[PDB]
From a paper:
Crystallization with a significant excess of cofactor (at least 5 mM) was required to obtain holoenzyme crystals at pH 8.5. The holoenzyme structure presented here has full occupancy of the cofactor in the active site, which forms the internal aldimine link to the active-site Lys288. This enzyme is found to be a dimer in the crystal, with the asymmetric unit containing one (apoenzyme and mCPP complex) or two (holoenzyme) dimers. Formation of the C. violaceum Am:PyAT holoenzyme dimer buries 5600 Å2, which equates to 28% of the solvent-accessible area of each subunit. This includes unwinding of the α-helix (residues CV 317–322) to form a loop covering the PLP phosphate group. The N-terminus (up to residue 36), which is disordered in the apoenzyme structure, becomes ordered in the holoenzyme structure and occupies the position of the unwound helix.
The crystal structures and inhibitor complexes of two industrially important ω-aminotransferase enzymes from Pseudomonas aeruginosa and Chromobacterium violaceum have been determined in order to understand the differences in their substrate specificity. The two enzymes share 30% sequence identity and use the same amino acceptor, pyruvate; however, the Pseudomonas enzyme shows activity towards the amino donor β-alanine, whilst the Chromobacterium enzyme does not. Both enzymes show activity towards S-α-methylbenzylamine (MBA), with the Chromobacterium enzyme having a broader substrate range. It appears that the different rigidity of the protein scaffold contributes to the substrate specificity observed for the two ω-­aminotransferases.
Author numbering:
A (entry chain B): 5 to 459
B (entry chain D): 5 to 458
Write the structure that this text describes.
């Protein structure tokens, strides 16, 4: 089909996630047709650099014919069987075993889902069930943060701190609370980032004491906030969050849906920041987005509590789906065996971070240049010296993002933050290629900003 | 790996849906390895008849090499791309256009998810967003039924009426209410099925008036309740439910996750019972379980309402997944082009129903022998005359289902209901082959009752 016709059929029959349906159907959808390595092509024939790896998830990049073969082979033998009827199958068994190999010690039990959002809902139910098993029925509140993102189920949307999501669904559901996010640029006042990390972590302590520790089940956080704009907390933050959770007997949960499977150069974001969660949620990079699968990695304390609780009345038809498991297995084994994660840690991550900071250092309206491993970002700001953001946060970021897309580069705006998370397998030449397009785009952005008299 | 090898790793590493992990680990998990047609082979080389089609979902049967090729092909060109970025891709656009021709009139727009549960969650947010768009911020309560099943998200479980689920996660969440299920055998008193259907339906009107109609956003129901035990509502039930919903400006939603894609003989469960829902949820048969994919089909009125509301701040990374959509597309085309649904209505459904009753009616403790299309059930009872159920609904079903298990037959126990939902492509010879193992299991079962002091 042509561009115009695929656009016509999409506008007529498709409801997109997180989209203005009326305005999209007017402008027309951009039709992505094929991918190879770090590159995409659209229906018009534009070669595009995918500086977002699909949706933070295509970690091995596009073009894995071995993954298609793994999919074909498994679908031919057993395309589906359920894990509900005192039943299992070799693909789910073999994946579970492999995951145990690459996860830290103590994470041997895994619960499968189809998505990061289902993993979060599963985790919420696990956390609350755990406290019931302990005879503490009031210990049910989960604390997340403003501008955190934990998916799109009613449960995950409530635990998330996106107001725009809360306003649709009568959210949050009860037993949720939120603390401010560890965003130093906005909230740091005259503290050092490290002083600020302690302050921002102790917001959890003061929330717990406001609520009553006996009512708090868990604190949940993305090691680095992804959708909120790659907010990288100070080094002092996570160890203090962990101290506080242990002080008050509150479960500690990492949402690893973005940071997992090598994004920071460790296998998991929590390893980078050096905390030890009781559970963590995954998806995305688990299969590099090649098939839908998510998981909850359940540490020993909680797993023992759940196993002591008899039946766990939860799950999805497609939990442990054999074909998705086969592809995840192929993916995880590749991340290990081809040295992809190790390469982020030791080679391409430090290169990207260095180049990133070199690239964006000069611009008058770029600040808070940050990142680690293969996730990185900056913020477009009104005045650097005053740490002053643009009003209507998001307007300026959108203008910038539009310059990127027109220049065949995918980087995302989260408010006025610009973020990137390319395939981990990106080469040095491809990093420089990407950064070259980005830099030219920021030159144009700075020129347009002065021209608008938005100076 | 051997049986014991697989079992040991499963106990060590895998937490299963809807399971007592301690006791599954102690017993050892049954390891399913391969499937063909309507049969499975396990780690021990038994030939097992799959009268549950995976999990009500393997509708075109096992062994569809053409599906594996569609998957392979799509995975090689573009294994993934997001639909969040003012972006789309051929496979999702193509599936969307195909669905609109097999779904009833006025269902042009689909929202993709990965699962039935996520579909239910999406439907809940849609219902509530819709009423906000309509300037009715109080119109937010969804009504389900006791023993209805709407998945396993916190939302779906709340809308669901399984007490055993509500007990885990602090459910239901707010703006959820529940009415009694149209289960004649227990609630029929002295009414005829058709009379009770009117009464069981009016329970909805009662609940609405109690809550207040201005607070009520939707009534949601599976056309035939599945996981609750294939409860088939009287013919009078759904039309009254629809009148009531229309009387009080309450949205009618069908959960078609089980009944969808040919299961009763129509494409959808609601078509069989002749109501017109404003939205309906789907998964399972959409891809015949070959790849995870679900959907919410939005009727014209609601679609109009959601579009007027600008941004819909909802969705999943793998929404519209290219590879799942290609496989869904190949499955839907197959169900239609290969005439598998049509055959359920005309050919195999009637046969299955007649023969089912013929096989099971004659038993002492088998009553309420029911079913339509390729979904069918019966209930294990203490006394047929008294409509007396066994004490502690569930004990007897297990005892019985465990006989099936060691006779290489899969039919599921829902309380003391026995249910079956085999692939739609099952042949008459297969139908007869399955019932014969069942009859013998039953003959065994009834005898084991007496020899126990019953
Ligand atoms: C994207 C995301 C999720 C939800 O995952 P889905 O697969 O889209 O349901 C949850 N947590 C985090 C941190 C995410 O980035
Ligand atoms: C199985 C089921 C669901 C949930 O679908 P999953 O894909 O398992 O999340 C929802 N509604 C009904 C009627 C179902 O049978």
């Amino acid at each position: 089909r042509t561009t115009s016709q695929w656009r016509e059929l999409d506008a007529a029959h498709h409801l997109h996630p997180f989209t203005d349906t009326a305005s999209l159907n007017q402008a027309g959808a951009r039709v992505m047709t094929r991918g190879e390595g770090v590159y995409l092509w659209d229906s018009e024939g534009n070669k595009i650099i995918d500086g977002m790896a699909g949706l933070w998830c295509v970690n091995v990049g596009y073009g894995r014919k071995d993954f298609a073969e793994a999919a074909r082979r498994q679908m031919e033998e057993l395309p589906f069987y359920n894990t509900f009827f005192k039943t299992t199958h070799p693909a789910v068994v073999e994946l579970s075993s492999l995951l145990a190999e690459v996860t830290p010690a103590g994470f041997d039990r895994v619960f499968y889902t189809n998505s990061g959002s289902e993993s979060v809902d599963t985790m919420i139910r696990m956390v609350r069930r755990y406290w019931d098993v302990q005879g503490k029925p009031e210990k049910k509140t989960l604390i997340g943060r403003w501008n955190g993102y934990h998916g799109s189920t009613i449960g995950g949307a409530s635990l998330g701190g996106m107001k725009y999501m809360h306003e649709q669904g009568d959210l949050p559901i009860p037993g949720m609370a939120h603390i401010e996010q560890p965003w130093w640029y906005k909230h740091g006042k005259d503290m050092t980032p490290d002083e600020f990390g302690v302050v921002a972590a102790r917001w959890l302590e003061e929330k717990i004491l406001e609520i009553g520790a006996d009512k708090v089940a868990a604190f949940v956080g993305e090691p680095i906030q992804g959708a909120g704009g790659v907010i990288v907390p100070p080094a002092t933050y996570w160890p203090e969050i962990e101290r506080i959770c242990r002080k008050y007997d509150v479960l500690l949960v990492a949402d690893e849906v973005i940071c997992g499977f090598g994004r920071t150069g460790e296998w998991f974001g929590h390893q980078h920041f050096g905390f030890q969660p009781d559970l963590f949620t995954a998806a995305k990079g688990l299969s590099s987005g090649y098939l839908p699968i998510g998981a909850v990695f359940v540490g020993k304390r909680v797993a023992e509590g759940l196993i002591a609780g008899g039946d766990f009345n939860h799950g999805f038809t497609y939990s442990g789906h054999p074909v998705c498991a086969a592809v995840a297995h192929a993916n995880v084994a590749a991340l290990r065996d081809e040295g992809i994660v190790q390469r982020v840690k030791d080679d391409i991550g430090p290169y990207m971070q260095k180049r990133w900071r070199e690239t964006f250092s000069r611009f008058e309206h770029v600040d808070d240049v940050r990142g680690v491993g293969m996730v990185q970002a900056f913020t477009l700001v009104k005045n650097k010296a005053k740490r002053e953001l643009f009003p209507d946060f998001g307007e300026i970021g959108t203008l910038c993002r539009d310059i990127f897309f027109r220049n065949n580069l995918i980087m995302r705006a989260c408010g006025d933050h610009i973020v990137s998370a390319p395939p981990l397998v990106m080469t040095r030449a491809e990093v420089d290629e990407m950064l070259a397009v980005a830099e030219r785009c920021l030159e144009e952005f700075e020129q347009t900003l002065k021209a608008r008299g938005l100076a």
